[PDB]
Amino acid sequence: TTHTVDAVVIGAGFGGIYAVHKLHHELGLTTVGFDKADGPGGTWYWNRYPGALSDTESHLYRFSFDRDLLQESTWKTTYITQPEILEYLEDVVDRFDLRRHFKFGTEVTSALYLDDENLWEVTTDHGEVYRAKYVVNAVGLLSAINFPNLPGLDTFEGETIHTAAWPEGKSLAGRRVGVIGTGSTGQQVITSLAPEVEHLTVFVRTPQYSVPVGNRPVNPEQIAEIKADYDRIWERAKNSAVAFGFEESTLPAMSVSEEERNRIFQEAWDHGGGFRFMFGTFGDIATDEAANEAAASFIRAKVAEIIEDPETARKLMPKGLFAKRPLCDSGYYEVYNRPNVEAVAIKENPIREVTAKGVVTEDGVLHELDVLVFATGFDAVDGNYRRIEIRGRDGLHINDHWDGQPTSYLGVSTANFPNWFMVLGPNGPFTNLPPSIETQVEWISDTIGYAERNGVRAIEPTPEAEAEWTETCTEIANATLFTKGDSWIFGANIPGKKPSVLFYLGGLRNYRAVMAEVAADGYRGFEVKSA
Ligand SMILES: Cc1cc2nc3c(=O)[nH]c(=O)nc-3n(C[C@H](O)[C@H](O)[C@H](O)COP(=O)(O)OP(=O)(O)OC[C@H]3O[C@@H](n4cnc5c(N)ncnc54)[C@H](O)[C@@H]3O)c2cc1C
Ligand SMILES: NC(=O)c1ccc[n+]([C@@H]2O[C@H](COP(=O)([O-])OP(=O)(O)OC[C@H]3O[C@@H](n4cnc5c(N)ncnc54)[C@H](OP(=O)(O)O)[C@@H]3O)[C@@H](O)[C@H]2O)c1
Known part of the structure; x- marks a missing residue:
């Protein structure tokens, strides 16, 4: 009664939608997506408050990967409202036949790595269990509600x-x-x-x-x-x-x-x-x-x-x-x-x-x-990871792994958590987010296809590579004023949350070059367990 799948995607916002498209259509993998939301949209499903509007301009707050879609979509105004974005994401889901691949009204409550079989065992609030080779977490950097x-x-x-x-x-x-x-x-x-x-x-x-x-x-x-x-x-x-x-x-x-x-x-x-x-x-x-x-x-x-x-x-x-x-x-x-x-x-x-x-x-x-x-x-960036039972190699809880500040290599991976990826995880780009999400999702799909085509049983970054990424983000962050800004960006908004860096502040161009070059360099900083 446990279900065997190649990939689990958590989240049905921009990130999850695109991850399911990539993993299922391009990689040819059996893929299941989850969201507690009754439908897709993420941010634009949940934030139905009056006045909800993007402040990325209409023509930029959307996907770029499909050139024809770019010619087809239309908008009323220079900025775009929640319902219009929601309608745009619903259409993307219809456009690529993604809806059938998602379980809505369904929260993932647990993800445990099984060392012996090199699989993730994922449990929902409904009690269903999945076993997956890959987990893509598109869980949102601004979705874990803070409610004092x-x-x-x-x-x-x-x-x-x-x-x-x-x-x-x-x-x-x-x-x-x-x-x-x-x-x-x-x-x-x-x-x-x-x-x-x-x-x-x-x-x-x-x-x-x-x-x-x-x-x-x-x-x-x-x-x-x-x-x-x-x-x-x-x-x-x-x-x-x-x-x-x-x-x-x-x-x-x-x-x-x-x-x-x-x-x-x-x-x-x-x-x-x-x-x-x-x-x-x-x-x-x-x-x-x-x-x-x-x-x-x-x-x-x-x-x-x-x-x-x-x-x-x-x-x-x-x-x-x-x-x-x-x-x-x-x-x-x-x-x-x-x-x-x-x-x-x-x-x-x-x-x-x-x-x-x-x-x-x-x-x-x-x-x-x-x-x-x-x-x-x-509780921004790390919040939705910490609220779930997630355990990597040797039963290490995410909250003990990130016992101090939350960390990543490249915004998309962390040590002791093999074949487990993040879209907009700790220490990624701070930008108009869609094209950053696209960069990460595309990069994750390429490394998963790589791992599949080669003999790969597990891929995870080394502790040294992660720490060097922490140091790179810290250096860059010291050069800006955001760090003295006293807000969610540096985790200062919840008493009880330790403040730290949470973004790579180098910008999209420099981020894209880092990502391109780590891949072109045979996944430098990752260790790769073969068959
Ligand atoms: C009001 C508002 C306005 C914004 N405006 C802009 C803007 O103008 N420009 C910009 O660049 N960015 C903006 N943002 C940021 C916005 O979050 C991103 O642009 C983008 O929508 C993030 O998409 P995502 O798929 O990564 O995350 P999300 O859209 O947040 O999707 C995450 C989904 O994961 C689900 N989920 C999380 N945990 C679980 C779990 N354990 N089990 C099942 N489901 C789970 C959540 O329910 C949610 O639906 C805005 C954010 C908000 C809140
Ligand atoms: N593009 C868009 O149109 C758009 C729209 C909405 C959200 N967003 C994204 O989401 C991010 C978060 O925005 P947000 O406004 O939702 O959250 P936010 O920036 O973190 O602001 C939360 C507000 O609540 C206050 N607050 C927190 N705890 C409180 C308490 N215990 N008692 C009284 N007040 C309290 C904060 O006050 P203090 O400042 O005193 O701490 C602050 O004014 C934004 O920065 C943005 O990136 C974007």
């Missing part, structure tokens, strides 16, 4: 929603709603909620820096232009650092005139785009403290220009390093001018407890709500 336990929470008589588990069709129009969190998710859901809702209470702990998204309609002339030049657009993207489709600046910020610097930021501001403001503006906003301060200072002044009430402005003024994930919005600061929206500064004025009726802050004020929305983010 506030005092008194289970006392709340109203509805509780995490944004990354928003129920389909759930509308909060006409309700009294509080939001916890003002990262990329909070800004989007706040902006969307405010006109529809009776009252919106925002519990803001750290106000953030955000530029306009500049999400504009696209006419058939506009999509045409893009599509006719799609080959060159993708080559530029795959030859850049972050692949968002603007040219990345090398120009130091303090090298230029005080006025042009202002004009450059202003033209970036009016154009829109979060990554463009940080990197298509000057080449050292992320690397030079004065350059970063100039950027930060520019945004701060817009905030003081937007928010009318001096007190509300003070509470929402972003402070400190402009060194979290770059943000952009469709009118976020504007909403705090609306009479129905209330800002609560929870650093000055902490939450005392949640009650039946709402949230009491330490000033002793009850904030009456009947819905609480958690835009509190994720």
